[PDB]
Design a binder for this molecule. Structure first.
Ligand code: DUT
Ligand code: DUT
Ligand code: DUT
Ligand code: DUT
Ligand code: NA
Lengths: 185, 185
C-alpha cells in the first residue's frame, strides 16, 4: 500500500491478464529501440527488451513499480517477428505448420529498491495448415498484429494442437509468476 | 531445482550466513573494479556493484545461480569506503560517533532465466565514541577492511547503541531476504 503499479504496455492482452490480479494500476509507455543483437540468444534478448521497456517508464516514475514484457516466437533458433506484409505472414505460418515452436515471454519489474526479470518458455504444436486456412485467417488481419503471424486466441486457436507450458504466457504475460514476484513488493 | 548455486564472494561473513540455508553451493573468486560513478545514488551504485560481481561469475558459469552482494556505510548521502590504511579509519569513526547512519547492502542473483537485485537498508545508532576507544580498535586490523572503519561484530559491537533493520544485512548479507528470493529460482 506504498507504491503505485504501472504496466508499461499497450497490449490489450497484457491488460486483460493483469486485471486478474485485481490491483489498481495505470498504463504508461515510452518507446524504446527494439534492436536485437545477432550474437545473443533469444532468451537474452527477450529479457533485455522487457527490461528496456520497463526502465524507460521507471526512469520517469522512480517511486513506482513498472512491469515491462515482450514475447518471441522461435523455431530452430530463428525467431519470427511481426509480418511486414500480408505475404510474409503467410510464409511465417507455412513455417509453423504441422510442428512445434517456442514462445518466449520475458517480464521485467522495476522499483528503486527491487528489480526482477525472467522469461517463460512454452512449446506450441501446430496442426498442419492449408493455404485456404492460412489466407482466410490472414484476412482477419490478426496475424498482422503479432510475432509469428498468429494469435492463440480467436481464430488462431484452431491451429494449436496443444501446448506444454503456460497459456497466458503465449498470450503475452505469465500472470501466475508475475503475480508471485509482485508479492515481494 | 536443476541449477547449482554459487556465491561470488571472498567474504567470510557472507559465507557463514549463506551456510544457514543448509543448501549445497560453491565459492568463486571474482575480479571486478569497484569503480563507482559519482553521478548515481548510494542505493543505485550498491545494487549496481552486487549486480556486477554476480554477473562476472554467471558469465563464466551460465548454467548456475549466482549470488553477489555489496555493503556500504553511508552518512548524510555521503558514503565512507575502506581506509587506505591511515587515520582514515580513525577519522570517520569520529563521524559515525554519537549518531545514526545507514548501512546499505545489495544482493544480486543471476541465472539465464531469472535475475534479481534488491537492497536492504538498516539504521545504525552509535554511542559517543572516544579516542582511546577508536585506536585500541584500530590495532586489531579489524576496523581496516570493513567499510565504515567498524564491524558490528567483535569490538565494534560496543560502539553500537542499537540498529533498525537487519543485523545480518549489516554483516553483509540479508540471508532471510536472500532465501525467500531463492524459493523462486
Ligand atoms: O516496432 C516496434 C514498435 C514498438 N515497440 C515497443 C516500444 C514500446 O515499448 C512498446 C509500445 O507498444 P507496441 O504495441 O508498439 O509493442 P508490443 O510489443 O505489441 O507491446 P508492448 O506495449 O508491451 O511493447 O512497443 C517495439 O518493440 N517495436
Ligand atoms: O546495445 C546494447 C547494450 C547492451 N545489451 C545487453 C548486453 C549487456 O550485457 C546488457 C546490459 O545489462 P542489462 O540492461 O541486460 O541489465 P541490468 O544489468 O539490469 O541493467 P543496468 O546496467 O541498467 O543495471 O544488455 C544489448 O543487448 N544491447
Ligand atoms: O577499492 C576497492 C577495490 C575493490 N573492491 C571490491 C571489488 C573486488 O572484486 C573485491 C575484492 O575484495 P573482496 O572481494 O574481498 O571484497 P568484499 O567487499 O569483502 O566482498 P566481495 O568478496 O563480495 O567482493 O573488493 C572494493 O570494495 N574496494
Ligand atoms: O558504469 C556504471 C556505474 C554505475 N551504474 C549504476 C547507476 C545506474 O542507475 C545503474 C543501472 O545502470 P544504468 O543506469 O546504466 O542503466 P542502463 O543504461 O539501462 O544499463 P545497461 O547498459 O546495462 O543496459 O547502475 C551503471 O549503470 N554503470
Ligand atoms: Na523473486
Amino acid at each position: 500500500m506504498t507504491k503505485p503499479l504501472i504496466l508499461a504496455s499497450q497490449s490489450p492482452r497484457r491488460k486483460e491478464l493483469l486485471d486478474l490480479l485485481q490491483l489498481p494500476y495505470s498504463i504508461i509507455v515510452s518507446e524504446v529501440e527494439e534492436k536485437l543483437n545477432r550474437n545473443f540468444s533469444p532468451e537474452e534478448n527477450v529479457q533485455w527488451l522487457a527490461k528496456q521497456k520497463a526502465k524507460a517508464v521507471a526512469d520517469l516514475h522512480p517511486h513506482a513499480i513498472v512491469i515491462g514484457a515482450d514475447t518471441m516466437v522461435c523455431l530452430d533458433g530463428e525467431c519470427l517477428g511481426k509480418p511486414q506484409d500480408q505475404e510474409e505472414a503467410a510464409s511465417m505460418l507455412r513455417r509453423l505448420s504441422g510442428r512445434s515452436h517456442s514462445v518466449i515471454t520475458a517480464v521485467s519489474i522495476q522499483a528503486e529498491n527491487h528489480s526482477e526479470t525472467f522469461y517463460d518458455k512454452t512449446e506450441v504444436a501446430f496442426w498442419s495448415l492449408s493455404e485456404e486456412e492460412i489466407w482466410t485467417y490472414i484476412e482477419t488481419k490478426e496475424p498482422m498484429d503479432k510475432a509469428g503471424a498468429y494469435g492463440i486466441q480467436g481464430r488462431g486457436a484452431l491451429f494449436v494442437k496443444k501446448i506444454d507450458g503456460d497459456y497466458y504466457s503465449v498470450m503475452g504475460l505469465p500472470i501466475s509468476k508475475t503475480m508471485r514476484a509482485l508479492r515481494h513488493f
